[PDB]
Symmetry: T
Subunit: 158 residues, 12 copies
């Protein structure tokens, strides 16, 4: 049950960014808490991490998810979420649950961060809760896949 975790642009440079917005945490410490989260709450979910500063690498990655190994995607397209209609399109072609995560609250920053093309493609969006946002996405995700296979087989024997 692979859960793809895609981080947008400058998310790797967390730590050099404003300590007033992203505090003092690295894209790794947050990746490991998602671990200590699925590690703690025994959830047979093997999650993979992928981060790029390319709009293209993200789209490709999304596209490789149509395989099977992957059953869901937690993504923070970052700054590309307000401009990338291409990533938004990719998020629609994937036949899997995609949850958008934003460390900061995009409603409370520059006017050009209020809108999310990508987030409007995903099923749900989370923003504002710092690194804690991905764990929330993890909860939500496991609860969705669960409730989707319970509807899938529920309408198989009928």
């Amino acid at each position: 049950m692979k859960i793809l975790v895609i981080q947008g642009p400058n998310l790797n440079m967390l730590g050099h960014r404003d300590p007033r917005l992203y505090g003092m945490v690295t894209l790794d410490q947050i990746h490991e808490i998602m671990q200590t989260f699925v590690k703690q709450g025994n959830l047979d979910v093997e999650l993979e991490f992928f981060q790029t500063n390319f709009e293209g690498e993200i789209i490709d990655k999304i596209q490789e998810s149509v395989g099977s190994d992957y059953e869901g995607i937690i993504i923070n397209p970052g700054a590309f979420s307000h401009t990338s209609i291409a990533i938004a399109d990719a998020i629609m072609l994937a036949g899997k649950p995609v949850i958008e995560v934003h460390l900061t609250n995009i409603q409370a920053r520059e006017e050009f961060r209020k809108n999310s093309y990508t987030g409007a493609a995903c099923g749900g969006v989370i923003m504002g809760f710092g690194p804690l946002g991905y764990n929330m996405a993890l909860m939500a995700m496991v609860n969705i896949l669960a409730e989707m296979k319970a509807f899938q087989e529920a309408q198989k024997n009928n």
Copy 2:
């Protein structure tokens, strides 16, 4: 540890609303799942429910939260979140964590639902995950109050 749960306008009429947006669930069944959630995961949080079609009752309610009995607020101001700068102001004067919850994804509907004055005042915002959104708010909330009293007393003996 009272957690105030405030539901905006037509949220009580869930069930008569489009089954394509809000499915088939009532504002009560969702209130009880928040129960079976705090009931299950033993969390000493006694949560209260309050719902109004008045912008005024919401503001008042928010204001009564400056008491002490309340330590956090999970709110879905509903349609008022795009117009009410007054509720947004109230959300700023309260000295407590407020998490905004939206059943639907406001990025994917009419243009006049994209912006949230209220949500930009809160710490974080959740949207799209149906009734499951409040449980996510519950997780987030307990994890915030916890991490706030661990910072509060952490800087008391120093």
Copy 3:
């Protein structure tokens, strides 16, 4: 066959308003003409009157209409029709015909009166014909309920 008649804000102060827009008539004289209208043309429609300066009282009232006693609503949300997406939402959840009435022509006044969130939810909208507008709504309404029970039972014995 109760027909709820809901008047928005300052509609009670008709008489103190500009005699150039609303002439010299009170919200009562207009309520009684709707009477002398259903009184004259024998139509078994008992209509109720309700007026508030609250967006909330209107929404509640709309909501109580899901009962049965009420079979239709003639409403003039007044100034709230250009701002209230909440009343507009309520007008959609009600499973009954709602006709919007405006004494004045909202196309011919301040730019902020041209749009009607509420009116776009209702089945039809009437504006410009002074107090005569509600009688037109009455005609229309009786003609709609009639043509709805003729379609209802028409597809019951088949």
Copy 4:
């Protein structure tokens, strides 16, 4: 007492249009119901029908109404009502009551149908009530001309 009835553009093609908007009725069946309406309720009003796909034919027609034979106009300028300031101007120069009628609710369609230049020139506007809209215009019209000759002669012997 000639009442000119002017139908805008594609209104003749009713029947080929979306059955979801204009149902299944022709510009004739609706013209005859306005008949069976004035025919039934004995009202000495001889109404004439005129329909064009030309903005020009409409303006001319409006202009010929300054004669005397005509005492009122029920019009549905259709798609020209959002663009034609020329028809709107004509509606102002005519010294007679003009009532604008729209089968559909122009508040609930494409953004470019919300505004009516023409409708803002007329005394009142009706929209949403299907073919029933013109009968409402007929009621309104007879009630206006009546109340205008009662004011005309009322201030003649004084």
Copy 5:
């Protein structure tokens, strides 16, 4: 000579608000300075205080002013002044002087506070001078009522 003093939304929570905008003063200390103001400068003006977080309570209150006991209104509709066309309408129907007061300078804050529907209905508007703003309104008001009864009777004996 009753002067109604109406305070909009979160104005009661002054003290919990930003000390950088509203400093450290309560809606009461400011109400008493308006007292020590009319108390000091002997002005036979008995002023009443009324504050609500409801757009509706404000409109009602305004409406009750058509009595006689009241001869003027000093109001700070607060956040509702940028959205409430209903309160603006009420301010026009009242046949008495209304002066709008804003503690802060609405020209120097968020873009959505620049416009005042309500303030454009009142005779004058004051903003920026902290609690001192209402005393200025008091001066202005007494100077207006005075200059209005001097014009009223001045054109009574002629």
Copy 6:
């Protein structure tokens, strides 16, 4: 204690302007009432008058105020208040209280008079109360300088 009084453009032509907006008063009669105001209420404030149709003369004048002779400025930049970011900048560089005064209510006129670049730089803004507006500015001003020297020396002996 020199208080500079700066009048913008066509303010000298008061008297030739619309009697419906500025009534029948000259820029002098209003200057003398500010006199009979400080003359009456014994306030050791010697106020100077300066009026120009130049954006430049105003800026210069503002700049000469950094002297000492001047302790405050009451200004009506007039039509330049909606366009002059240069006068607005000057109003920020001056280290003294500036109060903006408008005879008319700029919220109730042409759309291009609603915004005030200059007024958003000043501490407060007054509009609508005819010539009485400057006396209000005078009150406010003396009350501010007073409350500023009471804070100045209050934090000198400590």
Copy 7:
């Protein structure tokens, strides 16, 4: 030397229009003054008159001007000048001087009359001077054709 004079829409109904805008003059009295103008000042210019409420008749007419009989066009496209890019295109294809005339000042009316697609195609535009506007166009026109044949032959013998 035929000068085509094209009048747009409702220009024939001059006389029924607002006496506050177009006074009391008919499209004929103004046509004859253009006569008594070329009649008086001996100018061998035979001018033709053409008026329509059709955007199409105007374009055609413009197109027939590529003949030879016509050497210039004085036009008032009226309300079509703000919407007709087609008439504007026609005004560009004609290889002759076109002068746009407006009785009223289109800068001082509804926002939708400020722009002129057609006028921006013509060489010059005149507005505000009532019927006197066409005589001004006549002067201008004769002075242009004159100065064009003096440049035409001036660069023929060289």
Copy 8:
């Protein structure tokens, strides 16, 4: 198999238009190349030509196409494609394939030529390729009607 070819406004004046946009070709030479095109590639398509400067003649023409003689329409509504919602409506009521053709590239000219109301109604749009655009429309059209009768009868024997 009649294919109606409708040319909008000033398309007949091709030749007098800018040689930089439309080169040196007449609406006839282009009509004959569509001939030498269907003449060469043996395609039993008899195409008719119709051109007007009237928005009305175009709509009528479109409407007459509901006959049978016509099986498709290649149209260049020209300048009316950016303003005519009426022609756009007509293009929707016709139950036949309509292909929009533009000699020039409307994306590369004045801002008011970028949008096509009419083109958004048609199945496809072609622009930029000079007269060659209609031959492309011809190819496309024959390929569509062919693929439509192969789907029509393909689901007739089943």
Copy 9:
């Protein structure tokens, strides 16, 4: 009968400006043609010339016109006509005819030259006809003053 002729900004530098817009003529040659115009057609009008690059000098000049020596103003506020609401205000306070003249056609240049605050204050506006524009203003002006003294005394003996 002094006619003030006011030239805005860079109008003195005519000759250094684009020969494609203003050709090859100086602000003097154009001033003398207005002379050879009133000189030729015997019109007892002594016209004065005034040109500045200051918005202030223009306003002052306008203001000095309330004298008597001046009976009309022909003005080209130039670039200030799109920004100067102050000059526009001055043009309203003057109790004399003001005609706005523009060498070029402001409808056919940069978007920021389309609107004229000043021109909307004047009685009429002329643009596009090169230096010939002022002579047209001269005709118009003499024809207006003439028709104003014929109305003035016409209603003096009655």
Copy 10:
């Protein structure tokens, strides 16, 4: 005679996309029909296929076309055509014909798909005709290169 065929973003995932927009066809089946098209109609054009989800790979590819092997480009920049001014710039630097192709009609979808920066750089644009669009581009292209070498050598022996 290499014709480069560049496909933008998610065009490879055709088949997983909405069957209502892109039907049931893969980026390959469409590539082979362009083959069976040049294969059938004997046209010595060897076309190459290139598809990326990168804005960068597209620009590079475009740039490599300045070689010689390539004589034209048929491109569908997809979602990047509305945002990529960089690809638009590349399309201008290439000294070869570029034809833009869109499977769907970008005039009939989300507002952010109406504009094409890239398409406005190309010579022509095709949209709406499903996979058939590229064959149309092929026709057009061969007809352009042909007509370009007939102009090239036509002005070589002269």
Copy 11:
């Protein structure tokens, strides 16, 4: 080789301005560094300094530069660069190189400072580098005049 250095509005008050934007430097210290710059790097450029708070004095000054004594202009129109189309026009009529300098980065401040009418007229624009900006302009300028006289005479002997 006189280089005119023109400083816009409040640039003389540098020192009283925000130390966070303009630091602690006076318009003189910066004028002398431009000296110690041309003084150090032996460049036969005698530069003159001119500063005004008048839009008019700037335009005049620009105009006097058409003399000869001046061979270039380094200017910081300051706040007038976003509003003054008149100064922008003057910058176009001058037949000399003009370089615009901004101490601060106008892209990073209030929305009304992003655009520069004046800067778009100049050859180049520099912003952000504090007082160092003018020295950069000096380098650039000497390098331009040099490269202009090397092109001037380079095409004189040919």
Copy 12:
């Protein structure tokens, strides 16, 4: 002292671009002049060159600059400067001086080139001076690093 020089998109194709904008120079000749610049003026600055058509390669490159080898960046993000908030973010996370360079004047081209997200992140911006712009950036840069190490150590021994 490595100075990273990053060139955006189509900057490598300089030479094929419009000779009217970028003249006749290649991205290399300009790179070598930056050499002959640091080569001439003995400045121990070893500058590196990097150019891509990828938004991603640029961000990466920026990110690698947090090393130490690099002490500054001169960048021309080209067309990405108006759209890339991601590159703008990267420019903020780097703890080094970044100077934005534009060959052309982005204030004087298409509306979509006026704004620079990236340039508003950098310390300063240079535009308009052709290849000479980078040498100006070089001067500025060396002068900044110098003045930064003089402030760095200046506050180390204290």
